[PDB]
Amino acid sequence: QEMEDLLYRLKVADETISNLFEKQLGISLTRYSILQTLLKDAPLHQLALQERLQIDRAAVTRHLKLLEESGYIIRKEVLVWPTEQAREALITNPSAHHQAIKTSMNQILTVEESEQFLATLDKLLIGLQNLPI
Amino acid sequence: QEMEDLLYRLKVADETISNLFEKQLGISLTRYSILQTLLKDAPLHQLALQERLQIDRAAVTRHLKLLEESGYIIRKRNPDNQREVLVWPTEQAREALITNPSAHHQAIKTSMNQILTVEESEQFLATLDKLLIGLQNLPI
Numbered sequence: 529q530e531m532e533d534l535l536y537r538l539k540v541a542d543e544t545i546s547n548l549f550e551k552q553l554g555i556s557l558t559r560y561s562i563l564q565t566l567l568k569d570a571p572l573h574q575l576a577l578q579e580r581l582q583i584d585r586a587a588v589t590r591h592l593k594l595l596e597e598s599g600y601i602i603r604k605e606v607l608v609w610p611t612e613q614a615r616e617a618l619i620t621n622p623s624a625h626h627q628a629i630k631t632s633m634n635q636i637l638t639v640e641e642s643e644q645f646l647a648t649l650d651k652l653l654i655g656l657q658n659l660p661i
Numbered sequence: 662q663e664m665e666d667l668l669y670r671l672k673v674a675d676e677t678i679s680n681l682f683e684k685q686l687g688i689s690l691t692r693y694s695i696l697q698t699l700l701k702d703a704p705l706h707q708l709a710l711q712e713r714l715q716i717d718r719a720a721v722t723r724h725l726k727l728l729e730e731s732g733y734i735i736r737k738r739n740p741d742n743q744r745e746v747l748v749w750p751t752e753q754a755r756e757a758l759i760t761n762p763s764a765h766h767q768a769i770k771t772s773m774n775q776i777l778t779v780e781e782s783e784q785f786l787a788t789l790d791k792l793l794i795g796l797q798n799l800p801i
Contacts (some may be wrong), residue, residue, distance in 0.1 A: 529697075531773045534782055536694045540715045541789050544677040545668055548796050561669040564662060582673050620771055628800050631773040636795030637788065642667060644787045648781050649674055655776030656681050660768045 552629045555600075558583070559591050563600055563618060566610035574606050669762055681772075685769050688757075691716070692724050696754050704747035707736075733757070 549557045558581065565580055566572065572580075578588050592608065595601040599615040616622075622630070639646070682690045698713060698727065699705060701723050705713075725748065728734040733754040739745040756762075762770065777785070 529774070530779075530782065531776070532693060532697060532788060534777075535682065536690055536714075537786060537789065538671070539675055539690055541793055543674050544793060545796060546672060547670060548799070549748065552799055557665075557669055557672055560665060564665065570674075581669075593710075613682075625800070630665075632799050633796070636664065636792060637667075641788055641791075642663070643793075644671060645785065646667060648777065648785045649670065651781070652777055652785075653674055653677060654677060656773070659681075659685055659772050661765065 563614050564608055571607045571609045574608055609645055692728055703749045767796040
């Protein structure tokens with residue numbers, strides 16, 4: 529009843545968030561997280577990339593294919609690295625628009641209300657995953 | 662990098678929830694909301710549903726076609742205004758969700774209602790709106 533309305537509002541929020549994210553940063557939310565994971569701790573196997581981001585094999589292959597096509601990752605038992613373009617685009621030399629977006633996003637919520645949001649999100653998922661039979 | 666992860670965790674949660682909800686209740690989250698809305702507030706025009714659900718005409722047309730084909734809704738013309746079309750729930754829809762739910766569906770409904778308290782539920786939605794408002798107000 530009220531629980532169903534919370535889940536639906538979360539679906540509408542995700543769809544709005546994902547569209548806004550891709551328009552402002554030029555990369556989808558999922559593909560942006562792939563690059564963040566690679567830039568922090570690379571190289572990684574694509575099986576490990578499926579685990580860390582929680583997506584199936586068919587999905588990861590599609591994400592990584594678009595990422596290599598757009599010059600952000602390279603693949604050589606399949607290892608995956610971020611390119612120099614990715615490190616520059618996200619970390620060492622981002623555009624003024626991306627710096628202004630990134631800085632503005634991190635100030636939307638405080639650390640307390642951000643931590644409480646993720647705490648409730650995990651409590652919700654655990655409850656839903658623990659439902660009868 | 663902290664905010665970008667939260668948004669991604671919110672996406673993964675949504676995808677996981679949507680799949681679980683459809684399997685557990687036998688109806689997708691969006692189509693289930695359409696029926697809940699219709700069982701409370703029918704008759705409703707297709708346009709009203711688009712605004713309430715925050716989805717375009719193509720999406721609602723798909724949802725309503727699926728619900729109509731499976732016997733959960735009907736679309737009938739107003740006898741006084743023949744070209745006006747009104748959406749209604751069926752007896753099957755009221756039975757499936759409210760008056761004759763399967764033992765499993767009743768157990769899922771009750772279990773879902775006791776996951777989060779009313780306070781942490783309302784605080785979550787408040788933080789969600791504050792997040793949406795902030796993303797909408799980003800430069801350009």
